[PDB]
């Protein structure tokens, strides 16, 4: 069920994109750091524990759901002086107790396969 439209929303984790770009790229919404973080973690916890790593994966590398239209969902693209590799490295740490501290399918707050 961990697919956009099903257990995962279409265009997943809008606020996490911004928090990732704010930190790495320096460009983001005009919101205080804690607010930026909170909104990201909120959207993340609203996703079933089991689908949480998949969601990160989609936000990082994007996804293409089958269908007549099928548009590219998520994915972190390059920003002026902010390559996609920098953003990805930080995005991978979102579930960490350091960041959002949320449990995945493993029951532990970590996604070992996400990065790379």
Residue among 87, 90, 67 nearest 76 (CA): 87
Burial class (CB in 10 A: 0-12, 13-18, 19+), 15: buried
Burial class (CB in 10 A: 0-12, 13-18, 19+), 40: buried
Q: Tokens at residue 30, please?
A: 């005009």
Rounded-to-10 torsion of CA 40, 42, 47, 49: 100
- Coil vs helix vs strand at 54: helix
Beta bridge partners of 63: 73
Residue among 103, 17, 112 nearest 58 (CA): 17
54 Ramachandran zone, left/alpha/beta (phi>0; psi -120 to 50): alpha
Instruction: Please list the active-site residues.
Output: 30
End-to-end CA distance of the chain: 23
Q: Tokens at residue 115, please?
A: 């990065």
Please answer whether residues 36 and 42 qualify as being in contact, where contact means their C-beta atoms are separated by less than 8 angstroms.
no
In angstroms, the CA 37 to CA 19 distance is 6
Beta carbons within 10 angstroms of residue 14's beta carbon: 13
| All structural domains of the chain with their residue ranges | 1-116
Q: Tokens at residue 96, please?
A: 């960490």
Beta carbons within 10 angstroms of residue 1's beta carbon: 10
Resolution in A: 2.2
Break-preceding residues in the chain (C–N over 2.5 Å) = none
Look up the CATH architecture of domain 1-116.
Answer: Orthogonal Bundle (1.10)
């Amino acid at each position: 069920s961990c697919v956009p439209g099903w257990a995962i929303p279409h265009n997943p984790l809008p606020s996490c994109r911004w928090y990732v770009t704010s930190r790495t790229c320096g460009i983001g919404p005009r919101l205080p750091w804690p607010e930026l973080k909170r909104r990201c973690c909120r959207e993340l916890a609203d996703i079933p524990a089991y689908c949480r790593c998949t969601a990160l994966s989609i936000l990082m590398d994007g996804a293409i759901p089958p269908g007549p239209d099928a548009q590219l969902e998520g994915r972190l693209e390059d920003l002026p002086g902010c390559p996609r590799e920098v953003q990805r490295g930080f995005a991978a740490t979102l579930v960490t107790e350091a960041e959002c501290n949320l449990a995945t399918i493993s029951g532990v707050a970590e996604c070992p396969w996400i990065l790379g």
